[model samples]
Target: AKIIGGFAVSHTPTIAFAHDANKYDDPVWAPIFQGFEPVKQWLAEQKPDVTFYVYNDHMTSFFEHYSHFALGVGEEYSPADEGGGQRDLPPIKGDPELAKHIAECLVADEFDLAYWQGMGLDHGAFSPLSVLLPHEHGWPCRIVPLQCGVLQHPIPKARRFWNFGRSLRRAIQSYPRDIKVAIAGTGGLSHQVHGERAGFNNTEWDMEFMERLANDPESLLGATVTDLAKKGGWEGAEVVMWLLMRGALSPEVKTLHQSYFLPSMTAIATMLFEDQGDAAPPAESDEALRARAKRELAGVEEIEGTYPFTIDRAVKGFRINHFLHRLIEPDFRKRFVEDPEGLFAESDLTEEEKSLIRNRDWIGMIHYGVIFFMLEKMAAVLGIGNIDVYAAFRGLSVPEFQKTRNAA
Candidate 1:
């Protein structure tokens, strides 16, 4: 895969609220929408297959167990309910294969990235993204969210984000698939939302920082987060994330579009950089790629009739697994027991999944990616015993299987 370009945008929560309320014509909110028009057009023209989104969580999806850097390797991501219910938008699709490969490469490169599944995205991701792409039926492309923890103490240094971008470039460039990828770094321009300096805004520093980011990113590396906060605002430290996007592209990049607008507490800005470097060499061989991807579970596949519930399986079976997991809900279980056909008709399950459940094929369910634990739950719902499940797995009667046990 190749990185076609990079983008920088503000992810202020108000952007979503304003966009949701259809405040596009309102003078206070029109700039926010106007700022993203060129970006939306650029995305339509470039049409990257996957976008590596870089943003921070605002104590929504992550709170106590925050990681400096985390990657989403799930099948899909839903918008988080940040106090006022989720935004009226459909779930964004995830490219699990690309995400898994990037996670493996980043770890191998010593980035120490944490990986997750079934993660919800907050305003940091959705605010700008909801405007960058068309989401009526579904998003035009898939996304892989790279969450950066910026609100908490002991955050990574400014240079660290730049280094992460370099590693990200390597990870994406080395991917074996022939696809186009884009990188989005989202955050602030210059504003503080709290403290005595609650309404601080440094227009001068914001413009200078944007100029340096597009032309000379290396110069900003020496500055600390505290330095940024003092010059811009306390929360303006998030501007470091833009260095990550800049570092991922060629050293010599051309700015296709740039805009800045400060309507409220946060100074919103947007920029587009087109990569000017030569094409990267061909990716590694398929055998080598597979070896690296499965290095953690080197010999597990040799185990007879064993499926380890890998990421591929997890994504492929997510729908069914989600349906089965919901059995823990009393209301859903009651409805299912009373009218299984009706429940199946209303569900998103495929014919294969419905047939697997109808037949009560324990082993077949395992092959279909339903974990054994969920099978146990389903068995309990049907008033079946553990021995019967074991017998079904081994193709024997419960009494026959029991006869082989010493305790029989």
Candidate 2:
């Protein structure tokens, strides 16, 4: 997994949409379109094997309920529509072997990251790429998504992410494979998305950040989230991801290209780094990996009816889980209720899964590794009460199930 190159780019959703809509020549968008031409050509020429992409989830695959430093280990990803509905882009292919390797290495290094086997990437990850390679094939190369926790406060520290890049560098280098790889940290040049400061962009600070990332990343290490927010606007704080990109590269490497254009919602910029042909850094021992694994699983395994929804389970039940999740919509619930088998036939789930749900074998679904919450969605769609669903899972009558709980 030798990293042949690295890059940092700002991802503005509107910019990508404009490209897809063939509005690149429009007076308002032409400047930004022209700015990206150089690197777009550069990427086409390089044609790297895969990209180790870093970006923030804009409450898409990850939402308020739960979020973490998620690594995409899935074999494919579809671009999400940011409220305007899904984008008309083909699903991007993923490099699962390399992704699995990085997840393992990150865990070995003590990072409690979430490995996502079925992540739908929002504009934060896809927008920059759409501009970088505006071709119809979607991303020219495969991607390994390394998403940072940015939408929420008390998120991973800037320095912590920098160190994560350091570890990521090791992870990429140590993979026992011969392929050209590129690391990309995408998002932010300076812009606020909400509150009173909406539509704000700091050109001065954005330029300073690009220069600092090129020459002296350590100088910016002392920068706190508050400082970033105060000077660059709250949303601009995402520039810390650039620190992660820079930290993964050589201390004094050549900056092949740099450009900036602030036309709309966010500042847009790009910087490319040359690879140093360096060896992978030292890695943690297996003992540490085992110890950490034990600590996380210790009590959970002993809990009789408890099962964690991990990456393996997530992949195994992805189609059915999402099918159940869609039931939250009244239209979808009506469609399913009217013709259950017809709806199930359209899904990618296996026949066994379709049968289990059609048969209303609640416990069979649980045994098939479906999450309890998703099962609840199916129950709600069927107009089944919570206690009845519980009774079904327990293979008992509603009264018997009620006996186990305290008085309502």
Candidate 3:
């Protein structure tokens, strides 16, 4: 894969609120909507296979335990319910294959990234995203979310983000696939939302930051987060993320599109950078590609009747596993035990899934992608013994299986 281009945009919640309320024609919101037209058209034309999105969680999907850098490696990500109900958007598809590759490369390059699976995305990702794509049918391309923990103090430095972006470019370019990719750094242009300086905006600095980001990103690296907050506002310090985007592209890049709008609390901005460097890197040797592919889980598949519960299986079995895992809840467990069929009726499980549960088909459940732990939970909920399930797996009677055990 190659980094075809990069995008930098603001991700304030006001954008989503306005879009959802259909305020496009409204005088106040018109500029924001109109500003994205060129971006939307650009993305539609580029049609990159994947977009590596850099965004910050606003205490929604992430709270107590957070990493400065986290990568979403799931097959799909749901829209998070931020105070109000979840957004009326379909789950965003993920490119786990490429994501895993990038993760491996980043780690090898010494960028410690927390891996996230089955996570929900908040407006920080979906606000500008909803407008950038024809999301009514679903997102046009798969996404790999790189969540930046910039909400708290002592966040990753602007220089660190710039270096991460450089590493990111290497990771993406080294991938063996012949696909195009885009890098999106989403956050602030300027504005604060806390303390005595809650309603702050600095258009002058915002404009200069945008200019420097497109032309000379290295100059902005020396400015500390405190310096950014003092000039742009506390939350506006997120513009550091834009440096990540700038660093991912070639030094000599052409600005395809640029726009800024500050209708309310935050100054929203968007810029598209067209990479001017060579798109294709030298191809990897066959041996190198093979070694990389087998680097993880090498020889594991040789074990008989063993499945590693890969990401593909995890996604396929997510609904069934989710349903069974919920048995930990007293109420859900009680209901399932009281009326298995009734519980199945209300579930999103397929008929095959319900059949596997109805028949207590332990081996069949495993073959159908149910993880052993979830199967154990289901067995426990139904008052089934572990030995019974073990016996079923071996195609033997429970007593016969017991005799094979030296303890018995």
Candidate 4:
């Protein structure tokens, strides 16, 4: 097995870069970098294969029509349109062979995930991307973007996302490339950023989620997407990104670091899971794979997504987020994990916003990491050969919804 280094999950956006300097680093913005310092050291030490970033598509670009859970296969990637214009960053290169291998594996596996070429990179890709790999002129490595349409509001189910991640791990291990890789699942730990729910807060849930995600993923892994929405309230479903990360990891991986701080409405936490440093797969009997198949076929047996998560997204998220994202730059990581407070004491977010994240409410926790537990367990159950839930979720036989940009 290729060595994999996993970071604890925390969507701390304060560490994001100010590409549009004049506008970004206001009296309110410079303080956000304080918390990123902690993670800086860990990232430098275990330099991963390309990082694969699993984050949502904020309104930065691509609204409605042709919402894609896509992979960027272009030769270069550039900053997304930031409201008035775009962030100021140089274009980053792409690893043609690696990107192609990942795409080939997905098509071969029968998962028809969409492919992107020469697309604008959004905050979902750039914000967290900035923190994990920060250099104004360049990224740490060529990036592979996995653009999840979760933000567009028509996301694949929790189980489907987790199963996609499982396929991702297999894809990574099978890749001929010998680079270290990291799979980062970024997004909400709770807080409604829009509408009447704009002031939504849930700190209790965020803390519980952190506790479960590290101690016993199984404890919360069985909840379905609908369940997550119900518990997460309006934006809680964003937690599905976590399942993408968990499903990519081996069950026995060890936890390296986990810290939770709410410098804003959403609880911002960071966690790390490094592979057990052993190439030996825990020896399984010949009956294991077959039994797993049968067990996976036993669940409720119906799912609704027409497409599945692919190896490309897994590889893409890991390569860029781990190796090249903003976390890779300067003194960011060290400030990020050590004490989130010190990192962003001077952040632009208001004091009220900071209190919400520190609260980590139930819905917020569900929004943060607990939903991943439900998702991973749900997909595991469906994938366990005891169930065929994936086929149903695939919604293959039905004519898909022709989602139009302004239709809703």
Highest-TM-score candidate: 3
Give the TM-score (vs. native) of candidate 1. Answer: 0.81
Per residue, candidate 3 scores C-alpha lDDT tens digits across 357-401 of 889899998988899999999899889999999999999999999
lDDT of 4 by residue, 1-408 (tens): 264766544443344534334334555444444344455556667666476777666655556555546766666778767575776667767554555555565554455677666568766666655665666677776666677777654667776777777666766666666687777777767666668767565677777766666556665667765666555546666777777777677765777766655555565666677765435553443234324423433343365321223334333333222221333444654544455576447454345434433452323322222332333332342233212222233333222322312342
Q: Candidate 2: which pairs clash?
A: none
CA lDDT of 56 in candidate 1?
Answer: 93
Query: What tens-digit string does per-residue lDDT give for candidate 2 at 1-408?
Result: 667778888887777778778888788778877877777777788888888888998887788555557888777889876688887777888887777667666786788887775657999877888777644766689988888888788887878888888887777776767777888988898889899888877788888988888988888888889989987888899888888888777666688888888777888888888877654434554345435434545677778976687555666677788888888888889999998878877778788888888898888888787888999988888888989988987889999899999996
RMSD of 3: 3.2
Candidate 4 global TM-score? 0.62
| Candidate achieving higher TM-score, 1 or 2 | 1
lDDT (tens digit, per residue) of candidate 1 on 256-352: 9999989888899999999875555425644565577567788887898788886677777777888888889998888767889999999999999
TM-score for candidate 3, please give it.
0.85
Please identify model 2 stretches exceeding 4 Å from their true place: 26-28, 117-119, 134-138, 279-317, 320-340, 351-408
Model 4 segments beyond 4 Å from truth? 1-3, 8-34, 152-154, 277-408
Candidates sorted on TM-score, descending: 3, 1, 2, 4
What TM-score against the true fold does each predicted structure earn?
Answer: 0.81, 0.75, 0.85, 0.62
